[PDB]
């Protein structure tokens, strides 16, 4: 199968949901779509190993919760009720981390699309990391990530891993960008509308 098309197809559906008048985002559909993004960090290599703990484990948790909890709204309401929003391992806290991962990939794709004709992924990877994850990482991690940037695959190599040529990759990557933009906005507002904040 072709991994970018599974991503675009799944997030298009979520986009339709959050673009609708009364959105109800199922934890099952949401968490499944997010797990389709996980292979991307492995492709980029050792620099993004932090995503195992900062993203993959966070998605794993939401997949667990999806068996007993209907929607993202219901999921957050439980944590608000139990006063465990910022508690380590809480579904709401993990949801916030998942949001950041989705955001980083959105920025990554945007920069890859912009830097077409350049076979180096250095700028897209460095800029996406610096914007989304760097403010949440201590010195050691940021240095390790910076070092790992030397081990990035070439742009052409990445596309080969994803099984697309330039033209087809541009379409599905842009499709994710178009879909994740309102999804990320919807997720942010779930926090902000309850004054929960989004920078913790």
Ligand X SMILES: CCCCCCCCCCCCC/C=C/[C@@H](O)[C@@H](N)COP(=O)(O)OCC[N+](C)(C)C
Q: Which residue positions form the known binding site for an N-acylsphingoid base 1-phosphate?
A: 54, 58, 93, 97, 137
DSSP string, 64-121: HHTTT--BHHHHHHHHHHTT-TTSTT-HHHHHHHHHHHHHHHHHHHHHHHHTTT----
DSSP assignment letter at 158: H
Asked if 88 interacts with ligand X (CB under 6 A), we say no
Least distance between ligand X and beta carbon 199 (Å): 12
d(CA 9, CA 146): 32
Q: Which stretch binds ligand X (CB under 6 A): 4-12, 19-27, 136-144, 178-186?
A: 136-144
Least distance between ligand X and beta carbon 46 (Å): 7
d(CA 200, CA 196): 9
Is residue 152 within 8 Å of residue 44, measured between CB atoms? yes
In the bound state with ligand X, the residue whose beta carbon lies nearer, of 53 and 151, is 53
d(CA 48, CA 65): 26
Phi/psi of residue 22, nearest 5 degrees = -125, 85
Asked if 149 interacts with ligand X (CB under 6 A), we say no
Least distance between ligand X and beta carbon 150 (Å): 14
Phi/psi of residue 26, nearest 5 degrees = -70, 135
d(CA 191, CA 41): 26
Asked if 184 interacts with ligand X (CB under 6 A), we say no
Q: Which of 53, 114, 171, 192 binds ligand X (CB under 6 A)?
A: 53
Asked if 134 interacts with ligand X (CB under 6 A), we say no
Q: Which of 131, 137, 149, 161 binds ligand X (CB under 6 A)?
A: 137
Ranked by CB distance to ligand X, the top (closest) residue is: 138
Q: Which stretch binds ligand X (CB under 6 A): 49-57, 85-93, 98-106, 188-196?
A: 49-57
Q: Which stretch binds ligand X (CB under 6 A): 8-16, 46-54, 152-160, 163-171?
A: 46-54
Angle at 142 between CA 140 and CA 143, to 5 degrees: 65
Query: What residues are designated binding site?
Result: 54, 58, 93, 97, 137
Asked if 50 interacts with ligand X (CB under 6 A), we say yes
Residues making contact with ligand X (CB under 6 A) = 49-50, 53-54, 137-138, 140-141, 144
């Amino acid at each position: 199968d072709k991994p970018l098309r599974k991503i675009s197809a799944a997030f298009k559906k979520l986009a339709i949901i959050v673009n609708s008048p009364n959105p109800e985002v199922p934890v099952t559909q949401f968490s499944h779509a997010c797990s389709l993004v996980s292979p991307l960090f492995g492709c980029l290599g050792i620099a993004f190993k932090f995503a195992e703990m900062d993203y993959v484990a966070k998605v794993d948790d939401l997949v667990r919760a999806s068996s007993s909890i209907s929607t993202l709204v219901v999921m957050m309401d439980k944590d608000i009720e139990a006063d465990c929003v910022r508690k380590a391992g809480s579904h709401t806290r993990n949801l916030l981390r998942v949001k950041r991962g989705l955001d980083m990939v959105k920025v990554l794709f945007e920069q890859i699309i912009a830097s077409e004709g350049d076979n180096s992924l250095k700028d897209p990877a460095t800029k996406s990391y610096a914007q989304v994850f760097a403010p949440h990482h201590g010195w050691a991690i940021r240095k390790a990530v910076s070092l790992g940037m030397y081990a990035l695959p070439t742009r052409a190599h990445l596309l080969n891993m994803l099984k697309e040529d330039e033209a087809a990759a541009k379409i599905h990557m842009q499709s994710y960008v178009n879909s994740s933009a309102p999804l990320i906005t919807y997720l942010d507002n779930l926090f902000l509308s309850k004054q929960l904040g989004i920078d913790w």
